[PDB]
Design a protein around this ligand. Structure first.
Ligand SMILES: CC(=O)Nc1ccc(O)cc1
Length: 121
């Protein structure tokens, strides 16, 4: 669910999901198109593609369980959807951590006309 993705992100990066990652670039937050602006935005793009592989799952509202084995994120067993949603979110959180160095404030609240492009998952 969206509440635990928020908490996973905070734990990984030290930044609050809202607003750091809810209006970033073209795909972080609320995103539908264009070319991802930078690495962090590519993380959001991949995250969206990952959810897109689960048409009969409800990522925003379905809750999963996970634990931290010394920093490593371990998804605990639940329903097939919960397991797969959890793996999508874990990947995104790690992707965010990996690209914190290039995170840029100029992409926050990024305008929708500047999202130009095409890209396939
Ligand atoms: C803050 C937060 O949970 N953001 C978020 C979650 C899922 C998604 O596909 C894009 C963004």
């Amino acid at each position: 669910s969206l509440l635990e993705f928020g908490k996973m992100i905070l734990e990984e990066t030290g930044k609050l999901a809202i607003p750091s990652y809810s209006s970033y670039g073209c795909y972080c937050g609320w995103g539908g198109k264009g070319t991802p602006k930078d690495a962090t935005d590519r993380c959001c793009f991949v995250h969206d593609c990952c959810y897109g592989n689960l048409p009969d799952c409800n990522p925003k509202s379905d809750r999963y369980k996970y634990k931290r084995v010394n920093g490593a994120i371990v998804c605990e067993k639940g329903t097939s959807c919960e397991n797969r949603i959890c793996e999508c979110d874990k990947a995104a959180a790690i992707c965010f951590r990996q690209n914190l160095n290039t995170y840029s404030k100029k992409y926050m609240l990024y305008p929708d006309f500047l999202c130009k492009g095409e890209l396939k998952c």
